[PDB]
Design a protein around this ligand. Structure first.
Ligand SMILES: Nc1nc2c(ncn2[C@@H]2O[C@H](COP(=O)(O)OP(=O)(O)O)[C@@H](O)[C@H]2O)c(=O)[nH]1
Ligand SMILES: [Mg+2]
Ligand SMILES: [Mg+2]
Ligand SMILES: [Mg+2]
Length: 169
């Protein structure tokens, strides 16, 4: 029936994985959201005229076993790799998440988008050029976002969906 896209949001703690997901799905900016809570968010949306279901796992990197987490990593179709533009360490951590995803999929051709979040903040330490060079090295799109203002939020997730469409054929 209706097309479903299974997405997974990964990245270092505090980059805005939860805020991005909640902004996309519920259209508000959360002030605080327990950093250990991992949950799935679903919504029917229209992307490029195609009505579909998004099924998004907001990961929290906890050690406790979750059969749902395993199912999303195994069957997840695309991944958002998120850092914050005011958090150099979170950008350095990106490679770890990409390498993990490649192992889960046993492939270097996994639908993926690099997300530089918190672009509303002036305290930038990761230049747009640094992130563009990383994305080019991976061969993936790079999108700057603000979960606070909504800038780039739909584009980040929808671009990932478009990458999944490519990978299917
Ligand atoms: N200024 C700003 N703050 C953000 C943005 N996204 C998230 N935050 C804040 O950063 C903190 C961590 O966000 P959160 O979604 O919990 O990060 P997570 O650990 O990756 O899930 C929270 O206090 C959010 O309100 C953003 O785009 N801009
Ligand atoms: Mg979170
Ligand atoms: Mg919206
Ligand atoms: Mg520098």
């Amino acid at each position: 029936g209706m097309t479903e896209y299974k997405l997974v949001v990964v990245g270092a703690g505090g980059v805005g994985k939860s805020a991005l997901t909640i902004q996309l799905i519920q259209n508000h900016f959360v002030d605080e959201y327990d950093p250990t809570i991992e949950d799935s968010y679903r919504k029917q949306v229209v992307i490029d005229g195609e009505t579909c279901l998004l099924d998004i796992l907001d990961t929290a990197g906890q050690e406790e076993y979750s059969a749902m987490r395993d199912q999303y990593m195994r069957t997840g179709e695309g991944f958002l790799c998120v850092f914050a533009i005011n958090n150099t360490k979170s950008f350095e951590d990106i490679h770890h998440y990409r390498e993990q995803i490649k192992r889960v999929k046993d492939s270097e051709d996994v639908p993926m988008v690099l997300v530089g979040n918190k672009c509303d903040l002036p305290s930038r330490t990761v230049d747009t050029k640094q992130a563009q060079d990383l994305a080019r090295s991976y061969g993936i799109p790079f999108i700057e976002t603000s979960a606070k203002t909504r800038q780039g939020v739909d584009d980040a997730f929808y671009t990932l969906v478009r990458e999944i469409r490519k990978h299917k054929e």
